[PDB]
C-alpha cells in the first residue's frame, strides 16, 4: 500500500487498543486541548469578570477555592456571543480576565464529544454491530449542548452558560429556577421521570438478574465466578425472573422477552433525558414553566395561595438576589 | 451571525435570484449527469440512506430557522413577530434613559454602581452602547434605534436632542412585549402574576423548531446508522457462526 | 426542594451529591446497558424487527458479550467482561446513592447541614473583593429565606418591612 | 486560607488506610499458587 492507504488502514484499524477512526482524528486533539486547558485553568486561573461589571469571580484552586467551590468561570457578559479565541485578546492576561479559557474549553469539548458520538457509530460499523449505541449517547450529549451552547445563544451570552464547576452548576440551576420556573416545566418533569425511572429500572434489572443467577459456585466463592466471559449459555434463568416479577405485580406487567426489556431500559432514560435537554433548549428561548401565580381567587377577588404561589416566593428570592450589581433597569429580560 | 445577519431586502431578493438560478442549473446538471466515481464510493445508495441525508439536512435547516426567528428582524419584522429578545432588552435601557434624562439626568456621565455607565458604556471595541446587562446585546440593530447611532455608536448629542415620541413609544412597546412567558401563555418573567395573556411568536417559532431540528438530527443518526448496517448486511444482528470480533486478535 | 436549597444549602451536601451520582449513574447504566444489548444482538430471525427472534426458554445468550466487551474496551477504555458483576453493579449504584442521600437528610432533621466552608467565610468577611460561586449561592439562599418565609411559615407571623428585604440593584 | 489543620492528616489517612488494605489483599492474591 501507499502511505495514505496505510494511514487509513491504521486510523480505521479494529485492532488498536483504543479505536481511532475518522471521528477520532478530530476527537483526540479537541478533547486533549479541552482537558489540558480545563486542568490548568481549574488549578491556576486568576479571577474572571463573568458578568462584565468588573467584579471578578475566583474559580481556581490556587486563588482560594476547594474542589467544591472551584470552577472554570464563564466568559464575560461584555463579550456576549462574540467569539473570543486567544488571538483576539491583546495578551494572555486580558484573555484570562475576560474568561477566555471557558470558551476554548467548551468549544473543543462540544466538538470532541460530538465526535465521540460519531466514533461510537463508526466502531459499531467496523465490528458488524447494530448502530444505535450512539443514539443513546445523544441524550447526555444533547444536554451538554443545551447548557453550554443553546442556552447562551437564546440569552445572548456565554456568561449564562453553565459554569465548569460544582458550585457553579448549582448557581446555574438556582438562577434557571428564578428565571424559567423549570421545576413547573413538563419537559424537566419528563427528565426527572427519566432519571428517577432510569435509576429505579437499573436497580430493578440488576436485582432481578442477580436474584436468578443459576448456581455454579460454592458459598465460599463469589457467585461472579459462576459466569465466564464469552460462554454461550445465559447465566440467569429469565423464566424464574419473570415468574418472580409477574407475581410481584401481575403477569402482563412483566417482560418475558429480553430484547423488549432491554429496549425499554434503553428507551425510558434516553427519551426522558432528551426531554430534559429540550426543556433547557426551549427555556433558552423563554418559553417557561407553568405559571399559576394567583390562579385561585375567592368570591370577592382575594388571592388564595396554592403551592404554586409559595414556589413563586422562593423564586422571587433567587431573582432579586442574583448578580446583585448587574441590573440597572427593573426587568430582567435576558 | 452568518446568514441570519441579512439586514436589507435588496440582499434578500438578490440571494433568491442566485439561489433560483443555482437550483435550476443544478437540477439540469443532475438530469444530464450520473454520479461520479468518488461520489459512488463515498455514499450509501438506498432509500433509507437518502432519507437519512435529508433528515440531516432538514435538522440543520431547523436550527438555522430557530436562530433566524430569534435574532433577525428583517425577514421576521418585529411589527408582526414582536421584538427580538435582544431588541426588547435594548428597548428597556432606551426607555429608562429617556425617562431619567427627561427628569434631568445627564446620561453620558451617569456612573452606575459598578463604575460602568448606568445608561451608556463602551463595547470591547469602544463603540458607545447601552449599559446594564444589555451590554451583551450591543450588536442589536433596529429602525427605531438606528437614528441615534453615529460613526462611534450611540451618539450622545442625538440622544440629548433628537429622540422623537415615536421612538419612546416603540421602545416602551418592545420592552413590555419582550419574548418571555410561560407555557400556559402568562406574559412576562417567571415570577410575574397572571394578567397578561402573551407568549411571543418568536418564542413559539424558535422553541418548536429547536425541538423539531433536534429530533430530526436524532432521526438522521438513527437512519444513517441503519442504512450503513443494512447495506453491509448486519442490521438484524451478528451472525452467530460468523461473529466478526471472533476472528480479530485480542486487544491484550 | 427549594426550601432545602435556601435553608439547608442541600446542594452543597456530599451525601446529597453521592445520591445524585447514584441516581444519574443508575440512569446512565440503565440506558447504556439496554442500548448495548440491543446493539450487540445475534441475528436470530429473518425479521428486520428483531424482538420476535427471542425465546424465553432459549439456553443461549441473545446478544454477544464478547463483541460488547470489545466495543466498550475500544471506545471508553474499559468494559464489563462479567455479566453477573454487571448486573450486581446495576443494583449497587442507584441503591447505594439513595441510601447516601437518606443519611444526609437524617443530618438535616437536626439542621446539621453542610451549609458553609468556614475558610471561605473568614476570607470573604475580611476581603470584600473575594468572590466564588459558593459565596454567590449563599446570596441566593438568603433571598429565598427572606422572600418565602412569611408565606411559607405562617405560624411564625413574620412581618418583614420592605426596607429589610435583601435585594440587589433594580430587581 | 484558614482551613481546619486536621484536614490534611484526615484526608491522607482516609486515602492511605483503605488503599493499603486493598493493595495488601491484591498482592497476596497474585502471590498465591
Amino acid at each position: 500500500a501507499n502511505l495514505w492507504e496505510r494511514f487509513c488502514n491504521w486510523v480505521t484499524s479494529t485492532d488498536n487498543r483504543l479505536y481511532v477512526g475518522w471521528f477520532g482524528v478530530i476527537m483526540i486533539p479537541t478533547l486533549l486541548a479541552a482537558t489540558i486547558c480545563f486542568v490548568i485553568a481549574f488549578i491556576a486561573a486568576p479571577p474572571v469578570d463573568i458578568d462584565g461589571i468588573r467584579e471578578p469571580v475566583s474559580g481556581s484552586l490556587l486563588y482560594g477555592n476547594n474542589i467544591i467551590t472551584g470552577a472554570v468561570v464563564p466568559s464575560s457578559n461584555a463579550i456576549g456571543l462574540h467569539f473570543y479565541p486567544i488571538w483576539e485578546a491583546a495578551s494572555l492576561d486580558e484573555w484570562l480576565y475576560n474568561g477566555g479559557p471557558y470558551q476554548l474549553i467548551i468549544f473543543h469539548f462540544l466538538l470532541g464529544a460530538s465526535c465521540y458520538m460519531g466514533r461510537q457509530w463508526e466502531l459499531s460499523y467496523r465490528l458488524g454491530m447494530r448502530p444505535w449505541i450512539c443514539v443513546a449517547y445523544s441524550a447526555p450529549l444533547a444536554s451538554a449542548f443545551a447548557v453550554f451552547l443553546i442556552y447562551p445563544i437564546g440569552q445572548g451570552s456565554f456568561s449564562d452558560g453553565m459554569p465548569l464547576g460544582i458550585s457553579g452548576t448549582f448557581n446555574f440551576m438556582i438562577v434557571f429556577q428564578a428565571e424559567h420556573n423549570i421545576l413547573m416545566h413538563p419537559f424537566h418533569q419528563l427528565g426527572v421521570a427519566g432519571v428517577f425511572g432510569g435509576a429505579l429500572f437499573c436497580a430493578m434489572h440488576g436485582s432481578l438478574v442477580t436474584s436468578s443467577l443459576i448456581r455454579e459456585t460454592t458459598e465460599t466463592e463469589s457467585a461472579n465466578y459462576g459466569y465466564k466471559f464469552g460462554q454461550e449459555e445465559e447465566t440467569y434463568n429469565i423464566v424464574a425472573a419473570h415468574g418472580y416479577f409477574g407475581r410481584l405485580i401481575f403477569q402482563y406487567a412483566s417482560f418475558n422477552n429480553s430484547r423488549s426489556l432491554h429496549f425499554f431500559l434503553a428507551a425510558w432514560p434516553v427519551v426522558g433525558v432528551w426531554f430534559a435537554a429540550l426543556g433547557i433548549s426551549t427555556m433558552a428561548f423563554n418559553l417557561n414553566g407553568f405559571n399559576f401565580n394567583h390562579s385561585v381567587i375567592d368570591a370577592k377577588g382575594n388571592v388564595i395561595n396554592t403551592w404554586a404561589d409559595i414556589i413563586n416566593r422562593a423564586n422571587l428570592g433567587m431573582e432579586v438576589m442574583h448578580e446583585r450589581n448587574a441590573h440597572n433597569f427593573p426587568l430582567d429580560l435576558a | 451571525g452568518w446568514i441570519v445577519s441579512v439586514n436589507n431586502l435588496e440582499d434578500v431578493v438578490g440571494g433568491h435570484i442566485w439561489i433560483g438560478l443555482i437550483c435550476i442549473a443544478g437540477g439540469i446538471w443532475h438530469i444530464l449527469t450520473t454520479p461520479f466515481g468518488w461520489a459512488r464510493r463515498a455514499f450509501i445508495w438506498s432509500g433509507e440512506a437518502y432519507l437519512s441525508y435529508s433528515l440531516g439536512a432538514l435538522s440543520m435547516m431547523g436550527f438555522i430557522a430557530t436562530c433566524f426567528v430569534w435574532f433577525n428582524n428583517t425577514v421576521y419584522p418585529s411589527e408582526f413577530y414582536g421584538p427580538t429578545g435582544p431588541e426588547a432588552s435594548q428597548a428597556q435601557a432606551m426607555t429608562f434613559l429617556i425617562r431619567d434624562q427627561k427628569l434631568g439626568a445627564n446620561v453620558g456621565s451617569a456612573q452606575g454602581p459598578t463604575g460602568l455607565g448606568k445608561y451608556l458604556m463602551r463595547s470591547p471595541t469602544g463603540e458607545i452602547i447601552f449599559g446594564g446587562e444589555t451590554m451583551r446585546f450591543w450588536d442589536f440593530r433596529g429602525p427605531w434605534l438606528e437614528p441615534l447611532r453615529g460613526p462611534n455608536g450611540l451618539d450622545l448629542n442625538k440622544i440629548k436632542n433628537d429622540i422623537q415620541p415615536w421612538q419612546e413609544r416603540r421602545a416602551a412597546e418592545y420592552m413590555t412585549h419582550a419574548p418571555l412567558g410561560s407555557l400556559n401563555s402568562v406574559g412576562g418573567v417567571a415570577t410575574e402574576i397572571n394578567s397578561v395573556n402573551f407568549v411571543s411568536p418568536r418564542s413559539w417559532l424558535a422553541t418548536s423548531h429547536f425541538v423539531l431540528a433536534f429530533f430530526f438530527l436524532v432521526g438522521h443518526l438513527w437512519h444513517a446508522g441503519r442504512a450503513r448496517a443494512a447495506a453491509a448486511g448486519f442490521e438484524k444482528g451478528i451472525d452467530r457462526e460468523s461473529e466478526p470480533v471472533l476472528s480479530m486478535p485480542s486487544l491484550d | 426542594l427549594l426550601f432545602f436549597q435556601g435553608f439547608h444549602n442541600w446542594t452543597l451536601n456530599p451525601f446529597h451529591m453521592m445520591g445524585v451520582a447514584g441516581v444519574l449513574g443508575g440512569a446512565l447504566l440503565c440506558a447504556i446497558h439496554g442500548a448495548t444489548v440491543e446493539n450487540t444482538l445475534f441475528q436470530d430471525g429473518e425479521g428486520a424487527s428483531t424482538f420476535r427472534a427471542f425465546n424465553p426458554t432459549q439456553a443461549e445468550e441473545t446478544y454477544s458479550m464478547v463483541t460488547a466487551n470489545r466495543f466498550w474496551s475500544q471506545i471508553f477504555g474499559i468494559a464489563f467482561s462479567n455479566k453477573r458483576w454487571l448486573h450486581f453493579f446495576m443494583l449497587f449504584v442507584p441503591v447505594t446513592g439513595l441510601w447516601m442521600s437518606a443519611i444526609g437528610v437524617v443530618g438535616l432533621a437536626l439542621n446539621l447541614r453542610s451549609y458553609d466552608f468556614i475558610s471561605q467565610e473568614i476570607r470573604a468577611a475580611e476581603d470584600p473583593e473575594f468572590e466564588t460561586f459558593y459565596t454567590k449561592n449563599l446570596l441566593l439562599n438568603e433571598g429565598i429565606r427572606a422572600w418565602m418565609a412569611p408565606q411559607d411559615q405562617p405560624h411564625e407571623n413574620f412581618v418583614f418591612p420592605e426596607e429589610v428585604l435583601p435585594r440587589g440593584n433594580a430587581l | 486560607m484558614e482551613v481546619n489543620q486536621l484536614g490534611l492528616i484526615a484526608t491522607a489517612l482516609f486515602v492511605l488506610v483503605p488503599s493499603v488494605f486493598l493493595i495488601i489483599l491484591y498482592v497476596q492474591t497474585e502471590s498465591q499458587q
Binding site: 487498543r17 | - | - | 484536614g7 490534611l8 486515602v15
Partner: peptide, 30 residues
C-alpha cells in the same frame, strides 16, 4: 497544602485510569 492535596488526589485518579485501561487483567474467552 489543600491545593497540593486536591491536585495529588486528582493526579492519582488519572494514573489509575492509565493502569485500569492499559494494565487491566485481559478478558479471556475460557
Amino acid at each position: 497544602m489543600e491545593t497540593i492535596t486536591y491536585v495529588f488526589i486528582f493526579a492519582c485518579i488519572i494514573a489509575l485510569f492509565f493502569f485500569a485501561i492499559f494494565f487491566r487483567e485481559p478478558p479471556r474467552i475460557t
